[PDB]
Design a protein around this ligand. Structure first.
Ligand SMILES: N=C(N)Nc1ncc(CN2C(=O)c3ccccc3[C@H]2C(=O)NCc2ccc(F)cc2)s1
Ligand SMILES: N=C(N)Nc1ncc(CN2C(=O)c3ccccc3[C@H]2C(=O)NCc2ccc(F)cc2)s1
Ligand SMILES: CSC[C@H]1O[C@@H](n2cnc3c(N)ncnc32)[C@H](O)[C@@H]1O
Ligand SMILES: CSC[C@H]1O[C@@H](n2cnc3c(N)ncnc32)[C@H](O)[C@@H]1O
Lengths: 318, 307, 303, 318
């Protein structure tokens, strides 16, 4: 919706990092002697109402380099905003494309592709699949922003949040469907039982032959207290270019930024954990031609059921 | 009297094999759906683009034969819980393939091994298969009384066998099963095929399997002693176990080659029949109760209701 | 030619003998009938054509592994659970079955003949390792040492009592039948293939599932190299005084290595799994590979 | 499954019509003087266990014409059967392809394409979408078998069948989901209130620019009795080539054939119908990139609710 894009745009810290990230990349690719000879082909993949487009303009001006912008966006409601902006403000430098990036047949290859396809668990928006599909129209020496992102998990104890999830039972579906789906939530009344560890990582452009975005991660969390496990808090880090990053991992949390809240992966039944014991969680990223979804299971100190098998309770639409 | 089958990991001709197995008096045949050694690639070229048929045709048997007489087996090379990422991914695709073919044939049961602690990814794949389609095929989990490591011969110089009494450690194969079936969330399609060893464990280890869904009881030929006549028999220890298993009404599978080469292969089965006939017969209680074993019924309320 | 009409697709083994006749084992791992066969080629370059073969015979079950028992004899590792011995006739046209003993309770995967030549050791998925006598045709000993499927066994070249074995339990056992406890565990990824060094009785190499080829001394400290991208199926040293090591894998390639496991040759000739290799005894620079793609490729190794 | 293909193959009447249909087409395309010069490229799209392949061989032999067969099949379990047959019986004349026809990149264009993608309501298997996707590798003068198929609807009264559908209520879904989905059923204890009328038709190859398989049909059924409408019986006719046809429409029902049973489209609530009144039903064929589904509603003599809006209760998977 309009107001969903509005609140995204109301975080200046995020876009300043994007601005700085592109700024740096322009200076690296284009030298000083080729300032007004080379025009870099930028392509915002998922332009929305065009904050990244604006940022790309600012980045080019502070760098003092020439750029050619595309603004790919599948949502036709947002495209209306882009074209009204483009007509009034930007002009012919920005070429608004109303298409899916996976489909769009490009008339030109890009030097840089910029994207904002990340959620609270990084890859829960299917940024991998989208940017993989948009990889063909990147130059062989082309850059992606972000170039990398990683997801983190940490076990939590919250009799509040457990009881909150519990109350999300709805008519006409599985009685325990609510436990087999993630939630975006400002975690407050909870207890982080162990330090976050990396779960899934993705690099763009992906050069690995037969690029598979399915994953299987085992994590072991040393607990030093008695407690009751109710779920796993999820965070993410993303490398935009080099040293320019965004993060919602508590220990490396970008200061001021309030764009993403943490994500929660509940479990059906609480699990007792004695001091000294290790919480062992397993996380899968699964997919078919239609859907992408996560599965997870606790294996220590006791086994839980495998949650969300075949994405029965929760899927992410391709 | 007793329902029995034959486990083979080698079938050169599927029609001929059944004939032999059937003549000996077995009810069903446990066999591979793909050739055990026929390892298949799914990712890396050019091995993934291997031409020709992947296995036997379904036409070689009738639909009814597949449905009643055959029990599938996962190929041994399929290891979904491998440390190597390539072998994992391949084993996933291979496991799905074989399971899907099992459903295609319409097999009543399919064997999958529990021969280690971590069978998490194995469980995850099976659970996915169960939640795809509307097949009602059973899945028998091959799990031993005593783990292979714990029954190995003490013949390694710099690695002697554990001579210590580990009460929890001797119950490890149950914990293998328990974790698997918990991960799969107590699927009614998943049951146990308990493989009996040469040396039976302590009594507590056997009591562990009370109240578990034991459908099969695999009996190697190697565990059979030889009598004065020169025919296969079992120990008094094993006899008491078989007597217990007959109460549960499980299907005894015979596996391994004919060590008693002088006699026929029927002898093994004939001994189980011999045991079947030679049991304490059902009393008035167990005669009438035969039918309502673990059948849930609502308690009568003669006050509220009229009987 | 007094032999089966057609051989099977999947070529499993290939060995040269003294004079230089190419033995061939093959299995049907697909289709109606899952059987195996044995073949002989006095003309190596005629392979794998069935019309131009010296000898040939159809076995009851598939051929997992074989090796020469000198000149006439051929020992087989069958899927049935039997270790089979066949012997060439005096004319060397027919192949009559010598013995066929069902002892293993599962597929016999690997087999190797000891120094004496009257004994051999087999490895099976039943987890056992058995010591045979080829004269009396009986099992001398039976060893449940491993805790998983026995992948590869390899007899010491110049020692009758000594042999290696490796299994999926992640053990590499060095054996010695003279000791009361014969097995001795040599101290990540599972071992798949074994190969004694020809000129050194205390050295051997092993390939793993991950594709790393290693170099081990029995005394000590090990050297290795990432040769293949997938499981190493087999390792065979050349007949040279300073031997070259040919390595095969499921990545559909062949690599010839020097003493320090440095890549000399590379051959992506096969399209399917490379199963065996055998150096020509006449011409030491030649190397014959066989695979499931049903090729019999002769490589010219730059020596 | 294997036994699902078995029962398909146990109807010799169907395949004899396919045999005859191809037979005729071969004689039309290939003259007598070009008997052994021209080899027709046939392509069975959805070969199954290969009855159509066998039929195509028989048809070529009775016609005495040369053919080159492909056998496209996506189901990999069936492909095992095809390849075992191909190795033993057919040979190199039949080229077994293990792929989706919509995906498969053809090495050669076809003179004829043969398919068996029809259900009880003709197009409820998405034969349109599949054959549209396989249309590119047909020759510009290429034939399709079937070339056309039509679906028929007829209002029925069955207090039995209504009460049968009623009892298909399942846990963890909409209480009235069962009424918003079709059923294959041997209609027996029922009353056909009016004569069947054509609903949807499809022609292959489709030459209409921007081929849309969405449809909207209005039917008016003159009723001449008092009754209570409980649903709509569905049938179909298909033209294989010319005068060779298959049909399960009662009045033009192929004699002997027992391959397809009729289909039933229920309604939530029974509708009274007086003698003289007209039952007016509306049927949509709807689709997106993932699913295809039917919607329907009665408009006379009284209005029913629109059934299966957005395929909430029933979809057909692409
Ligand atoms: N930014 C992109 N391109 N993609 C994205 N995908 C996911 C994103 C993160 N969020 C959600 O998944 C979400 C869900 C419901 C409601 C809100 C959110 C949102 C969120 O966590 N916002 C924080 C917030 C909320 C309220 C507030 F007053 C101030 C800050 S951002
Ligand atoms: N033939 C293709 N390529 N496609 C097809 N799609 C759909 C087809 C028609 N049918 C079904 O939709 C269906 C559903 C469940 C059970 C059975 C059927 C089947 C059917 O109506 N068969 C009739 C029958 C049933 C039982 C019997 F003893 C004898 C005859 S045929
Ligand atoms: C600014 S939030 C991310 C934006 O990316 C857009 N988007 C997501 N996936 C794609 C895609 N595959 N092609 C084009 N735009 C996309 C979404 O519609 C949203 O406006
Ligand atoms: C004989 S029943 C119809 C057959 O067509 C096959 N089929 C259906 N759609 C396709 C498709 N798009 N590509 C290939 N085969 C298909 C089905 O798997 C089935 O075996």
């Amino acid at each position: 919706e309009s107001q969903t894009y509005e609140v995204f745009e109301k975080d200046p810290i995020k876009y300043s990092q994007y601005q700085q990230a592109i700024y740096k990349c322009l200076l690296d690719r284009v030298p000083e002697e080729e300032k007004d000879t080379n025009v870099q082909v930028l392509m915002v993949l998922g332009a929305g109402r065009g904050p990244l487009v604006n940022a790309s303009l600012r980045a080019a001006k502070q760098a003092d380099r020439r750029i050619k912008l595309y603004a790919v966006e599948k949502n036709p409601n947002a495209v209306v905003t882009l074209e009204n902006w483009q007509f009034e403000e930007w002009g012919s430098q920005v070429t608004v494309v109303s298409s899916d990036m996976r489909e769009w047949v490009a008339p030109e290859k890009a030097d840089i592709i910029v994207s904002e396809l990340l959620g609270s668990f990084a890859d829960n928006e299917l940024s991998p699949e989208c940017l993989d599909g948009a990889q063909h129209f990147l130059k062989d020496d082309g850059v992606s922003i972000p170039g990398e992102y990683t997801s983190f998990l940490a076990p939590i104890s919250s009799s509040k949040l457990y009881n909150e999830v519990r109350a999300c039972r709805e008519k006409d579906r599985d009685p325990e469907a609510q436990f087999e789906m993630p939630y975006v939530v400002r975690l407050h009344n909870f207890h982080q039982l162990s330090a976050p560890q990396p779960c899934f990582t993705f690099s763009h452009p992906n050069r690995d032959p037969m690029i598979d975005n399915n994953r299987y991660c085992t994590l072991e969390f040393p607990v030093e207290v008695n407690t009751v496990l109710h779920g796993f808090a999820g965070y993410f880090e993303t490398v935009l270019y080099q040293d320019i990053t965004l993060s919602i991992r508590p220990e490396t949390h970008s200061p001021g930024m309030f764009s993403w809240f943490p994500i929660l992966f509940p479990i059906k039944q609480p699990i007792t954990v004695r001091e000294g014991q290790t919480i062992c969680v397993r996380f899968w990223r699964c997919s078919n031609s239609k859907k992408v979804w996560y599965e997870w299971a606790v294996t220590a100190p006791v086994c839980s059921a495998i949650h969300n098998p075949t994405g029965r309770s929760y899927t992410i639409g391709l | 009297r007793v329902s029995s089958g034959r486990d083979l990991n080698c079938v050169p001709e599927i029609a001929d094999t059944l004939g032999a197995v059937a003549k000996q008096g077995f009810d069903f045949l446990c066999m591979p759906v793909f050739h055990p050694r026929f390892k298949r690639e799914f990712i890396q070229e050019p091995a993934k683009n291997r031409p020709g048929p992947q296995t036997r045709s379904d036409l070689l048997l009738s639909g009814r034969d597949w449905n009643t007489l055959i029990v599938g087996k996962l190929s041994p090379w399929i290891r979904p819980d491998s440390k190597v990422e390539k072998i994992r991914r391949n084993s996933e695709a291979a496991m799905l393939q074989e399971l899907n073919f099992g459903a295609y044939l319409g097999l009543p049961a399919f064997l999958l091994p529990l021969n280690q602690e971590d069978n998490t990814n194995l469980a995850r794949v099976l659970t996915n298969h169960i939640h795809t389609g509307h097949h009602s095929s059973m899945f028998w989990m091959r799990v031993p009384l005593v783990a292979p490591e714990d029954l190995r011969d003490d013949i390694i110089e710099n690695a002697p066998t554990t001579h210590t009494e580990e009460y929890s450690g001797e119950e490890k194969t149950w914990m293998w099963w328990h974790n698997f079936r918990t991960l799969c969330d107590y699927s009614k399609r998943i049951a146990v095929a308990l493989e009996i060893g040469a040396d039976l464990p302590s009594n507590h280890v056997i009591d562990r399997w009370l109240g578990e869904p034991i459908k099969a009881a695999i009996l190697p030929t190697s565990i059979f002693l030889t009598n004065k006549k020169g025919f296969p028999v079992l120990s008094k220890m094993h006899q008491r176990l078989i007597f217990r298993l007959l109460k549960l009404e499980v299907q005894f599978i015979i596996t391994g080659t004919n060590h008693h080469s002088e006699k026929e292969f029927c002898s093994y089965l004939q001994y189980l029949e011999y045991l079947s006939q030679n049991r304490p017969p059902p009393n008035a209680y167990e005669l009438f109760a035969k039918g309502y074993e673990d059948y849930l019924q609502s308690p009568l309320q003669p006050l509220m209701d009229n009987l | 030619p007094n032999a089966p009409a057609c051989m099977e697709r999947q070529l499993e083994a290939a060995r040269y003998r003294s004079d230089g006749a190419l033995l061939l084992g093959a299995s049907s791992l697909s289709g109606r009938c899952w059987a195996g066969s044995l073949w002989l080629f006095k003309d190596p370059c005629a392979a794998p054509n069935e019309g131009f073969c010296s000898a040939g015979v159809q076995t009851e079950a598939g051929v997992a592994d074989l090796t020469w028992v000198g000149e006439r004899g051929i020992l087989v590792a069958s899927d049935s659970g039997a270790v089979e011995l066949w012997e060439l006739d005096e004319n060397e046209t027919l192949i009559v079955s010598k013995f066929c003993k069902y002892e293993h309770d599962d597929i016999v995967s690997t087999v190797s003949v000891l120094s004496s030549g009257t004994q051999a050791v087999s490895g099976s998925k039943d987890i056992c390792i058995k010591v045979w006598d080829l004269a009396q045709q009986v099992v001398l000993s039976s060893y449940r040492a491993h805790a998983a499927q026995v992948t590869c066994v390899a007899a010491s070249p110049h020692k009758d009592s000594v042999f290696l074995s490796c299994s999926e339990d992640n053990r590499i056992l060095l054996w010695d039948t003279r000791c009361p406890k014969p097995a001795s565990q040599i101290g990540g990824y599972l071992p798949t293939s074994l190969a004694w060094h020809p000129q050194q009785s205390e050295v051997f190499v092993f390939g793993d599932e991950n594709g790393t080829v290693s170099l081990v001394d029995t005394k000590s400290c090990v050297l290795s190299s990432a040769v293949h991208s997938q499981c190493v199926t087999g390792l065979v040293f050349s007949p040279h005084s300073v031997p070259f090591l040919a390595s095969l894998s499921e990545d559909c390639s062949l690599a010839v290595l020097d003493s320090s496991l440095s890549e000399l040759f590379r051959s992506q000739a096969h399209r399917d799994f490379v199963r065996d290799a055998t150096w020509s005894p006449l011409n030491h620079s030649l190397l014959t590979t066989v695979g499931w793609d049903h090729q019999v490729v002769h490589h010219v190794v730059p020596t």
